[PDB]
Structure 1
Amino acid sequence: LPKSYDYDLIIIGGGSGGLAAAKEAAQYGKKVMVLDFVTPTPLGTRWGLGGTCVNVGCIPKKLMHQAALLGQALQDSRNYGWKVEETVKHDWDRMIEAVQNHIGSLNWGYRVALREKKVVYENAYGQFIGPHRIKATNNKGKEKIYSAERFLIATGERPRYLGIPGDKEYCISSDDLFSLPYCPGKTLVVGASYVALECAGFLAGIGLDVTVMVRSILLRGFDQDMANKIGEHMEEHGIKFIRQFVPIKVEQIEAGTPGRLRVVAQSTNSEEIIEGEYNTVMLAIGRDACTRKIGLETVGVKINEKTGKIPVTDEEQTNVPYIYAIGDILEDKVELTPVAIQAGRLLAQRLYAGSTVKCDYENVPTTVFTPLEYGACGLSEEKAVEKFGEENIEVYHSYFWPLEWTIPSRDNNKCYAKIICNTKDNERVVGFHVLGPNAGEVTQGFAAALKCGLTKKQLDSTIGIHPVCAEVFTTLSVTKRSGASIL
C-alpha cells in the first residue's frame, strides 16, 4: 500500500548517466538498484561495468589520441635537442594492453563505488514487463523480477551498421577497435562522424595506412568551415579520403589476424562503382538508441519510433510519470558523458532532495579529438546567421601558431580561432570555435564565460596569458565582413 516495492529506484544501464544517478541517489538514503548488461558485438567483444565512455568511448579514444600525439612529440624533440632516431616503431599490442589495463582498473572502481554506496548491482539485462515491474535476465538465462517506485532509463546506444553484405561478419566498429587483438593494418574507416575522424586520426598517428570513405560532408551538425579545416589538416597529414561513396559489399579475400577484405563501393551521384583491398574496415556511421528491446510498451513509455529517441520533459520525465530517462537516448539533447552525468545527478537531487535545478542543455561545450583538436561552444557560424540574420552577425577570426611548433618548424598557420557575435545584442559571443592543440582545455573556461553573457567588449577587456594559445581570443580584431586577410 505505502511503497512496498522492492526498490525506491531502478536504473536500467550502468553507464555515465546511470552510475551518476545511482550514486547521487544512494547518498540521500534511497534503496537503489543498477542493472547493467553488455550485449556482445557481432564478433563477440564485451566489456565491464562503466558505459560507452569508459570501455569503448572517451577514455580509450583519448588515450590512443595521446599515443599519437606522443609520436609527434618524439619527432618534435629532435630540434629541441633530444637525441632520438628519425623513425621510432610503435607496438599495437603493447598499447592496447595498457589501455585495457586502465579500463579494467575503472571497471573495478565503479563496482567498488557501488558496493561502498550501498547500491545493488546486478549484471543483467533489463526489460519492463508491466507497471512498476521489470524483468532482469542474467548472463546464464536466469531471470528475476523486481518492482520499484520509479525507474530511470539510461541505456545509451550502440554502433549502427549498414544493411549490407559482409559487414556484421567482417567489419569492426568503435566497440571492437579499442580491444583489437592484432594490429589493424591497412585500415578503411567508413563515415565522417566525430568518431570516424578521431579514430582515423589516431590510427594514422600511430603509423597505419588509413583511408576514410565519406558519404557527403564531414561532421554534419558541426560548423562547416571548421570541419572542412579539420578535413584539410587530416588530408595534409597522411589520412586519405574517398569522397561521396558508400560501400555496398565487403568480402573476405582471406581470413587472418588481420586478414584481407575487399570493399566494393558505389558513388552517391554517379553509377560509378569502385573496389579496394584493406586489412580492416571500421564502420563509424552512426549509433542506435537502445530503446527498442526493453519492453517500453508494457509500461506505456512513448518513444519516437522513427529515431529511437525517448521524448522527455525538461526534468527528464517521460510520458509515464514514475519513469525517467537520461543520456544519449534522449531526444534533442546533447549526446555527451558530462551531460549524461549532470542530468543523472541533478535529477536525483530534484527527486530525493528538493532541488529545483534543471539540467541546462544550452551551449554545452564539446571537443573533437582529431589529430588537430577542435573545441567548441555555442552556435556554429551557419546556425548563428540563420537564427539572428546574416546582417546581425559579426565574425571575428584569426590564424595562430603555437610557440611550441616553431622550433620543430612545422604547421604554421593551421590553427584557427573564431568567435561569432550578435550585433543586435551588444555583440554577445554566441559561438566559440578553436582548432588547435589542447582545444578542450582552451574551451572549457570560455564555456563558463558564455554562461555569463560574455560580450565582445568584455572579452576585449580581458588580458591574455603570454605565451599560450588561448590568448589569441583576447585580441581578435579582424572581422570576416571586413575582408582583411588573417593568413
Structure 2
Amino acid sequence: SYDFDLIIIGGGSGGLAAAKEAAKFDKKVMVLDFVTPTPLGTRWGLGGTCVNVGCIPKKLMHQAALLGQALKDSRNYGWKLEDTVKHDWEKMTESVQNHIGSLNWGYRVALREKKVVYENAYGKFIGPHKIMATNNKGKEKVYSAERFLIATGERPRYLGIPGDKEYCISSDDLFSLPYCPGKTLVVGASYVALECAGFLAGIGLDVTVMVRSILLRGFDQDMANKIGEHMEEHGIKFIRQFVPTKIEQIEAGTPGRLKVTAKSTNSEETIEDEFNTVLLAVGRDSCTRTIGLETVGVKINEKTGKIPVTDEEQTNVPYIYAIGDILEGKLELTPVAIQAGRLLAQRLYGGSTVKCDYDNVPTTVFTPLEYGCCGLSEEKAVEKFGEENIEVYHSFFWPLEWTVPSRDNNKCYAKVICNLKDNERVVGFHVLGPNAGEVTQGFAAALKCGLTKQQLDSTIGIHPVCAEIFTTLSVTKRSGGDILQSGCXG
C-alpha cells in the first residue's frame, strides 16, 4: 500500500497546521500548495490566504493607518511634530511583503524540519486514494495516500458584470499593489470591504464604499451601524443601496482611471463617478469545484460549494477529510482552521477523542474603530431565547488615551447580552473600541466557562483600561436609562 499516510491538499492555515501536527506522530506526510494566479496574474508563496492576502497583510496595513492616527495624537502629548506627515504606499507595501516573504520561507523551512514533503503543485483527485499533482510548468506526477485532507480554502468572487476582472482588484491584489491605489471605490460591506476601506482611508486616500443592502450581514446590526457611522464621521464616503453595472477603463496607468456606473437597489436611477482603483470585496467561493472530487465521490453542496462534514471533519468518503473555510456552516477564520486541523491530526494518529469546538468562536472586525465580539448577536439571542427573556447591559466609554488628543468621546461602546432564563448567562459579548481583539479574547474564554452577569460583576476592573467597562455594566437597554452623556465623573 500507499506513498503517504496523509496528503494535505492546500498549504494554508488549516493545511500546514494539520501537516505540521501529523509529523509529531512520525508518518509520511505531503503538502500540495499552489497559488492559482488572480485575473491580472498575482502570485505568492507557501502559507495560504491569511499569510499572503489576508490577516497578516490586512492587520499590518491597519496598523499603518492607526500609526497615522498615532502621529496626530502625539502633538498633544508633547511631541513637536511638524504639521502633517505624508504616507508612501510603496514603502509600506514593501515592508509588508518583506514580512510575508519571511513567513513564506518560514513555512517552507518548517515543513522541511518536521520532515513533511512539500510539493508546489495543484492537487486534483484522479481516483480512489490517487491524486494528480500538476506542477507549475505543466508536468504531472501521480501520488497515493491512505488518507486525504482537503484544505483548499476559497478565493475572491467577482460580480457578474463587465470590466470587473480586467480593471478591478480583489483582496488578493490590493496587498501587493505596485502603485498607490489613489481615489478608491470599495464595493461590498462585510469584514473585507470595510476593513480595507478603513485602512485605505486611514493612510490618506479618497475612499467610497458602495453598499448593496446592510453593513456586515451576520454581525449584530446595531454594532454594524455604529461601525458605519464611525467610518463616515472619520472621512469615508458611503453610497447606500447601489450595485455597479459596469466598469470601463477611461485610461491605462498605475493607477489608471476607471469609470463606475451603478444602478439602484430599488429605484431606476443611475450614478457615474470615476476612481483610480475599484476594490471588489463581494464574497469568496470555495476551491472545491476543480479538485476532481467526482473521481472519489466526495459530496459537496452544489449550490454554495461547501463540503458538509461530520463533527470530526470527515467528508461522506471515510478516508477523506476537510478543514477550514471550505467546510459548510462553519466559521471561516484562521485560528478555527488551525485548531480544527491540529486536533484532527490528534484524533487520527495520536488517539485523542477531543473534537473541535465551533461554538462561540470570537471574531474581530478590524475597522478603523475595531469591533470585537463573541457569542450571539442581540437579534439572534432574541430569536433564540425569546424577546423579554433577554436582558442587555450596555454603555459608551472613552479610552483614556483619547482625552488628551481631545477627540472621539462617546463613540466606543460595549454591551453584554444576558439570558434571564439562565442566571443571566452572557450569551453575547460586544465591544467597539481600540484593541478590540485583545479585549475580547479573555471574555471568550470566560464564555467557554459559561460566564454569568453576576460573576462578571464580581470581577474587579483594571484601571485605566478599556476592557474594565465590562466589569461595571449596570444600565440595561430595557431599563431605558441614558448611557451617553458624560462624565467621566459621577
Which TM-score band applies after superposition, normalised by the shorter structure? over 0.9
- Confirm whether residue 360 of structure 1 aligns to residue 357 of structure 2: yes
Partner-residue secondary structure (3-state), 1:10: strand
Q: State the distance in 1 between where 2:49 and 2:83 align.
A: 37
Q: State the distance in 1 between where 2:160 and 2:350 align.
A: 47
What is the CA-CA distance between 1:247 and the residue it aligns to? 0.3
What is the CA-CA distance between 1:284 and the residue it aligns to? 0.2
1:174-197 per-position Cα deviation (integer Å, ceiling 9, x unaligned): 000000000000000000010000
What is the CA-CA distance between 1:375 and the residue it aligns to? 0.3
What is the CA-CA distance between 1:86 and the residue it aligns to? 2.4
Partner-residue secondary structure (3-state), 2:7: strand
Partner-residue secondary structure (3-state), 1:443: helix
1:230-309 superposed matches below 5 A: 230-309=227-306
1:422-447 per-position Cα deviation (integer Å, ceiling 9, x unaligned): 00000000000000000000000000
Partner-residue secondary structure (3-state), 1:334: coil
Q: State the distance in 2 between where 1:5 and 1:272 align.
A: 62
What is the CA-CA distance between 1:248 and the residue it aligns to? 0.4
Partner-residue secondary structure (3-state), 1:78: coil
Structure 1 unmatched ranges of 5 or more: none
Q: Is the 8 A contact 1:223 1:381 kept in 2?
A: yes
Partner-residue secondary structure (3-state), 1:291: coil
Q: Is the 8 A contact 1:33 1:121 kept in 2?
A: yes
1:290-344 per-position Cα deviation (integer Å, ceiling 9, x unaligned): 1000010000100000000000000000000000001100000110000000000
Structure 2 unmatched ranges of 5 or more: 485-490
Q: Is the 8 A contact 1:191 1:283 kept in 2?
A: yes
Q: State the distance in 2 between where 1:387 and 1:187 align.
A: 40
Partner-residue secondary structure (3-state), 2:418: strand
1:47-98 per-position Cα deviation (integer Å, ceiling 9, x unaligned): 0000000000000000000000000000000000000022110100000100
Q: Is the 8 A contact 1:349 1:355 kept in 2?
A: yes
Q: State the distance in 1 between where 2:374 and 2:287 align.
A: 28
Q: State the distance in 2 between where 1:300 and 1:320 align.
A: 7
Q: State the distance in 1 between where 2:268 and 2:3 align.
A: 60
What is the CA-CA distance between 1:273 and the residue it aligns to? 1.0
Instruction: Choose from 9, 13, 18 the match for 2:10.
Output: 13
1:324-380 per-position Cα deviation (integer Å, ceiling 9, x unaligned): 001100000110000000000000000000000000000000000000000000000
Q: Is the 8 A contact 1:159 1:287 kept in 2?
A: yes
Instruction: Choose from 68, 76, 80 the match for 1:79.
Output: 76
Q: State the distance in 1 between where 2:284 and 2:235 align.
A: 27
Q: State the distance in 1 between where 2:2 and 2:196 align.
A: 45
What is the CA-CA distance between 1:16 and the residue it aligns to? 0.2
What is the CA-CA distance between 1:236 and the residue it aligns to? 0.2
Partner-residue secondary structure (3-state), 1:114: helix
- Confirm whether residue 440 of structure 1 aligns to residue 440 of structure 2: no
What is the CA-CA distance between 1:285 and the residue it aligns to? 0.6
Instruction: Choose from 36, 41, 48 the match for 1:39.
Output: 36
TM-score by length of 2: 0.99
Q: State the distance in 1 between where 2:75 and 2:60 align.
A: 24
Q: Is the 8 A contact 1:396 1:418 kept in 2?
A: yes
Q: What's 2:487 paired with?
A: none
1:305-320 superposed matches below 5 A: 305-320=302-317
1:208-243 per-position Cα deviation (integer Å, ceiling 9, x unaligned): 000000100000000000000000000000110000
Partner-residue secondary structure (3-state), 2:4: coil
Q: Is the 8 A contact 1:75 1:86 kept in 2?
A: no
Q: Is the 8 A contact 1:134 1:145 kept in 2?
A: yes
Q: What's 1:157 paired with?
A: 154
Q: State the distance in 2 between where 1:86 and 1:69 align.
A: 18
What is the CA-CA distance between 1:408 and the residue it aligns to? 0.3
